[PDB]
Design a protein around this ligand. Structure first.
Ligand SMILES: Cc1cc2nc3c(=O)[nH]c(=O)nc-3n(C[C@H](O)[C@H](O)[C@H](O)COP(=O)(O)OP(=O)(O)OC[C@H]3O[C@@H](n4cnc5c(N)ncnc54)[C@H](O)[C@@H]3O)c2cc1C
Ligand SMILES: Cc1cc2nc3c(=O)[nH]c(=O)nc-3n(C[C@H](O)[C@H](O)[C@H](O)COP(=O)(O)OP(=O)(O)OC[C@H]3O[C@@H](n4cnc5c(N)ncnc54)[C@H](O)[C@@H]3O)c2cc1C
Ligand SMILES: O=C(O)c1ccc(Cl)s1
Ligand SMILES: O=C(O)c1ccc(Cl)s1
Lengths: 340, 340
């Protein structure tokens, strides 16, 4: 049984790990390879601040809500493990700010100690008059991807720096199952009009007194098109750029100023923080995640493809659930081959 | 009108600032000098992490409850000021962990978003079954002391490195009012049996993923004789040593281990944190702060003395109220001399 996983992002590696943890014992020849064009720290996952929070509105597929909750419980149960430092995982609390009162999220009971903002708390943010406060988790991709890589390598999973041209290309060379975790660039392997790039830009500043995250929201501008501040381990992430359909992997001066004046007005103490870096990424935007199988009628036989892409701006938040779901789908494939 | 402030701690410097802010315009000859045996970073104020939290039990003097609340409001009104980073001031949330249920604190409404710990939150800490959660302030002493110094110097307040031997020594050289902010060493100038050293020891470690404070409580051992973790700007403070009557300004290997074993069992992720430093300090313990005037019938005339010491392990937490109160006592002195 030869499996080929396309994509070294959080979705590809975590999926590869789950599939191995669940079926390495029950498949004698379970050979898993990872074909990826870019590896950490050159993936969209590395640019993400890594905060756990789903979109404020309920998803078109309710399974995602379960996937988010499965991931949060998974990561939380290791927030205090000895190797939590290696995963880039830790607890963090912060504010969600609005202009007008809006309805509680569906994940109010997934995060810890969710509550409305006290009037005294809203006085520190004059431009906003309503919001929440809660404790959540940050899973920094740079560390998490490197941790996943060390586990896959010690499990015999080999890695190859290689751009896949088509699914048949992999099938022809012997792959039995193709796990498509190719993110925003998925259309190049099988055209998908629902997948589009949610371009984002962030800068990382040195502001170690920042102990809370501050996510601001403006329904007119769109989600994450508003200032936000997510303290990381070594640096503080400043963001608020969400440009749909822009394929420019290049830091734009205008967005730089947008991020700066927005966060400096939200946290005036930021004016005297040194800028450490700036990066751009593409949220794999899609009306809903595409986590499903597909029988590829290519060549003499059928190669089994399982898609996992289109996680938008919550890839780190749901990655575990999607991985477990993709592992299930892999299992169902084994039963149909009658080797389970 | 010559004033002399003995002590360059948080109380000595903040009091010297309040006195100048209020009476530099109504006293033509207001010449203030600061006599201190040690200056930053060699004072007890430097050893303290700087967290704002009063003792859990109500104070034997109900004024201090107002002083604590005044300082908090004051500091909170500058948390987003541009020079907040200069003061070492920033918001921070955290936990107070208890083995058993205990009554709420008097300051429950001073801090932001006070609440009890959710069952899920208490599952992170097996050794504790009840606790609080709230947002508070940290005023790092090393920065705050340096900030006060810059304000006082630019106001003409001259500093001198000098060990005062007696109140009469200062009065004989021309002092009109003496502001006694000499802290735990106050006894050497006027014997006080209620003032005793609450020796403490802390170590500062590099664990930038720590975003919350974790204060442990055990009534048997006594307050602050239990593990606590307070993330600062550049480092995390690990403490839990409160030894009454110990005058040894020396790091003790036994207290080192007690601090490490305690905090590592409280936060397992700490076992892989590099130890940056270790310091010993003496809380100026007293049944209640001594903030009062006293006519010293010394020499030909009476030199006015005003005491401000005995703040124990909450100096940073009340320092501002005490400075404002010592400014009032300075005013009444101005009225009595009939130059107000
Ligand atoms: C600015 C920004 C901030 C974000 N912050 C957060 C956050 O705080 N919390 C959160 O949960 N989410 C956040 N996100 C979203 C998150 O980054 C993404 O959802 C997640 O990184 C998606 O990962 P992925 O594995 O699907 O694709 P990405 O990690 O890109 O992985 C793509 C992988 O597929 C490979 N690949 C693609 N095509 C081929 C090919 N043809 N041949 C071989 N290999 C190929 C790529 O080279 C790479 O290996 C943020 C996104 C942005 C842009
Ligand atoms: C380990 C530890 C942690 C703490 N953490 C906190 C905390 O988190 N939050 C909080 O609010 N409080 C905390 N505290 C308590 C706080 O540190 C003290 O209450 C506060 O610093 C009191 O300082 P002070 O200005 O009164 O005197 P200290 O800063 O000692 O200063 C005394 C000053 O008087 C000078 N002086 C003394 N005698 C003479 C003399 N004879 N002649 C000339 N000068 C003299 C000294 O040299 C020094 O200049 C902590 C204390 C300890 C020990
Ligand atoms: O900018 C983004 O895409 C995001 C910010 C915070 C989360 Cl969570 S996603
Ligand atoms: O050890 C101490 O003296 C203190 C710890 C936390 C505050 Cl606040 S004081």
């Amino acid at each position: 049984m030869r499996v080929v996983v396309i994509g070294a992002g959080v979705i590809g590696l975590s999926t590869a790990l789950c599939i191995h943890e669940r079926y390495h014992s029950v498949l004698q020849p379970l050979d898993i390879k990872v074909y990826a064009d870019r590896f950490t720290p050159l993936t969209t996952t590395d640019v993400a601040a890594g905060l756990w929070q789903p979109y404020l509105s309920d998803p078109n597929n309710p399974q995602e809500a379960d996937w988010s909750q499965q991931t949060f419980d998974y990561l939380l149960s290791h927030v205090h493990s000895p190797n939590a430092e290696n995963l880039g995982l830790f607890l963090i609390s912060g504010y969600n700010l609005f202009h007008e009162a809006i309805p509680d999220p569906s994940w109010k009971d997934t995060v810890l100690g969710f509550r409305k903002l006290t009037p005294r708390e809203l006085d520190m943010f004059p431009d906003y008059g309503y919001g929440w406060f809660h404790t959540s988790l940050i899973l920094e991709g740079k560390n998490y991807l490197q941790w996943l890589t060390e586990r896959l390598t010690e499990r015999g999973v080999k890695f190859f720096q290689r751009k896949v041209e088509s699914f048949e290309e992999v099938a022809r060379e012997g792959a039995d199952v193709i796990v498509n975790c190719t993110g925003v660039w998925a259309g190049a392997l099988q055209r998908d009009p629902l997948l589009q790039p949610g371009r984002g830009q962030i800068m990382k500043v040195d502001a170690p007194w920042m102990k809370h995250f501050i996510l601001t929201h403006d329904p007119e501008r769109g989600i994450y098109n508003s200032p936000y501040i997510i303290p990381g381990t070594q640096t503080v992430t400043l963001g608020g750029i969400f440009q749909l359909g822009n394929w420019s992997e290049l830091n734009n001066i205008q967005d730089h100023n947008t991020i700066w004046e927005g966060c400096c007005r939200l946290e005036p103490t930021l004016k005297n923080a040194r800028i450490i870096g700036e990066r751009t990424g593409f949220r794999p935007v899609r009306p809903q995640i595409r986590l499903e199988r597909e029988q590829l009628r290519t060549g003499p036989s059928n190669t089994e493809v399982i898609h996992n892409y289109g996680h938008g701006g919550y890839g780190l938040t749901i990655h575990w659930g999607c991985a477990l779901e993709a592992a299930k789908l892999f299992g169902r494939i084994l039963e149909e081959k009658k080797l389970s």
